[PDB]
Every structure is written in structure tokens, then in C-alpha cells.
């Protein structure tokens, strides 16, 4: 059946479409929250995040142009900082930076989110997240999201439609089978697998 395949269909699917998350991990609480009566700055705070665990997690949704979705926590606008200004301000705060142990970006945080990609609007559970104001009164304030708890992670389903869609339909149906056709799934980052389409149940 030859030595090479034609690529006949290419499609990209992202868990939260245009939105990605910045994740900031610190050893202790860096933020204040509206209504709290006493400061928790520099407190250790363990929490359920997949499992019981001792670090503080902050998250920040963002788009490639540096904008961020309008984000509600319960009924309250979290007033999120634009991501570029936030990176400048967070690293300008000596107190904040000395406590931070990692920072990374991810396409999926283990949760299905109440998210409207078109409207660029995100609504978060107030029992799991809270407004996080990080400020030192010298540099710019940071308004972000603190993760209070995520007890369990969950799967998000991406429906790509008819599994035979995109292949040329031959008069001879056997030419739809492997090795004559194959579906490949890849992240173009080194991970990939070939699927025999007929065996997708």
C-alpha cells in the first residue's frame, strides 16, 4: 500500500479553547481577600487539591494577546489584572517573589469550567476559589485567584464528530481500514499515537 500516507485532515482542539491558565505556587499565603477580618499573610495553608497537600496555589486565566476573561467568583467580579502587568507587579514585590516556588502554564486544570469563550467570561465556584489581592503599597496591585480547594479532578470530553469524517470514502470499504488509513492524535510536542479508526468503539 506504498511507503507514505497523504495527510487529508487536520484539526486542533483545546480544553478551554482560547483560554490558558498561569499557575503560581507558593509556600505560604500571599494575598488578602475582601471581607476577611484578619490578615493571613505568610500563613502556611494546606488544602485538598487532588489530594491533601501543603502548598498555596494561585491561578490566572489569560489569552494570547494578554487580555484576561471577565471572571466571577460566585456573584462577585474578581477584577483580574491583565496578565503582563501582573507578571511585572508580582515579581516587583519582594515579599511575594521570595515565597514562590514554581510558575507554569497549562491548558487544563483538572476541572470542567463554567466558561463562555465567545463572551470571554468565566464563572468560578466560591467554595473552591476566592479573590486574591496581592499588594505591597509600592508597586502595582495584583488581582488574581486563590485556589481554596479542588477535592477531585474530572474529565472533560471533546467531541470531534464522525470518526470517518475527512477520509476519502472508497468504493471498497476495506481501504478505510488500517493499514490503508490511520487516525493520528498528537500534541506536536513529542507525544503521539496512531489509532486504527475501525477499532474506535
Amino acid at each position: 500500500y506504498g511507503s507514505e500516507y497523504d495527510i487529508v485532515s487536520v484539526e486542533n482542539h483545546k480544553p478551554y479553547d482560547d483560554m490558558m491558565f498561569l499557575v503560581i505556587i507558593s509556600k505560604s499565603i500571599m494575598h488578602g481577600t475582601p471581607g476577611e477580618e484578619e490578615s493571613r499573610l505568610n500563613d502556611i495553608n494546606a488544602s485538598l487539591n487532588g489530594m491533601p497537600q501543603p502548598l498555596c496555589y494561585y491561578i490566572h486565566p489569560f489569552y494570547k494577546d494578554g487580555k484576561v476573561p471577565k471572571t466571577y467568583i460566585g456573584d462577585n467580579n474578581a477584577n483580574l489584572s491583565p496578565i503582563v502587568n501582573m507578571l511585572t507587579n508580582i515579581f516587583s514585590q519582594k515579599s511575594a517573589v521570595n515565597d514562590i516556588v514554581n510558575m507554569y502554564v497549562t491548558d487544563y486544570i483538572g476541572l470542567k469550567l463554567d466558561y463562555k469563550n465567545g463572551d470571554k467570561e468565566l464563572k468560578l465556584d466560591k467554595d473552591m476559589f476566592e479573590q486574591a489581592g496581592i499588594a505591597d503599597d509600592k508597586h502595582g496591585n495584583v488581582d488574581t485567584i486563590f485556589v481554596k480547594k479542588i477535592p477531585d479532578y474530572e474529565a472533560l470530553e471533546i467531541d470531534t464528530g464522525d470518526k470517518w469524517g475527512g477520509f476519502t470514502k472508497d468504493q471498497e470499504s476495506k481501504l478505510m481500514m488500517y493499514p490503508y488509513c490511520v487516525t493520528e492524535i498528537t500534541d506536536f510536542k513529542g507525544n503521539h499515537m496512531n489509532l486504527k479508526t475501525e477499532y474506535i468503539n
Binding site: 500500500y1 485532515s9 510558575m103 490503508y180 498528537t186
Partner: protein
């Protein structure tokens, strides 16, 4: 990871991927070249598929013709055994059964009956 601007600072290229638009997962569908599609499709059209099953043969399941090739086939009947043996040999060697008067014209679709 993103660089952490603390006193300790001085791997991997996150910018290359994100900046060139690579995120999430990709579905890539691939199929054999036209040269081999032509070859294989024309062959299956005339000679059907490899089956490797013990079963009664498909004799009249297509509109125009059926190719049949058996091995050690079982055929009985109220027929002298010499002719029965010759008939079994015919099917073990392969034969095309034509259901149309246009015998030999392979250009037809030959769809299922």
C-alpha cells in the same frame, strides 16, 4: 515553566510552542496514496477480500458478479462422484459467477444485492 525572577535565577522552550500557535491536541487523518488506492481498489473489485472463514460461500450476493475461491470445500448432491469432484476442484481453484449478461465487463459498480 516560566522564569522566576528571584535571587537564584541565572529549561525547555515554552515560547516557541505557544508563540507559533501550538496548544491542546491535534487530530491528523492519513490515507494511502492515489497510486496504491487505484491498485488495491481495482484488485478488491475483481477478487473480493481475503476471508479465512469456514462458512457457506457467497455465490449470489452482488448485483453483477461474485468471485469465489475455497480450499477443501464441501459439496454434496445426487451427482456422480466424478463430476462432484470436478466441481469441488473448480471452486478450490477460484471462479467468477456472473449474474448479468454482460459477462466480463468489470466497469460496473457490482453493488450488494
Amino acid at each position: 515553566d516560566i522564569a522566576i525572577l528571584n535571587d537564584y535565577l541565572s529549561g525547555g522552550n515554552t515560547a516557541f510552542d505557544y508563540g507559533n500557535g501550538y496548544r491542546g491536541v491535534y487530530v491528523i487523518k492519513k490515507q494511502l496514496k492515489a497510486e496504491y488506492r487505484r491498485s488495491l481498489s481495482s484488485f478488491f473489485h475483481k477478487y473480493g477480500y481475503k476471508i479465512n472463514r469456514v462458512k457457506k460461500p457467497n455465490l449470489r450476493t452482488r448485483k453483477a458478479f461474485n468471485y469465489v475461491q475455497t480450499k477443501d470445500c464441501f459439496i454434496s448432491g445426487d451427482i456422480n462422484n466424478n463430476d462432484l469432484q470436478e466441481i469441488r476442484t473448480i471452486f478450490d481453484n477460484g471462479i467468477t459467477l456472473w449474474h448479468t449478461d454482460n459477462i466480463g465487463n468489470y466497469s460496473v459498480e457490482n453493488e450488494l444485492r
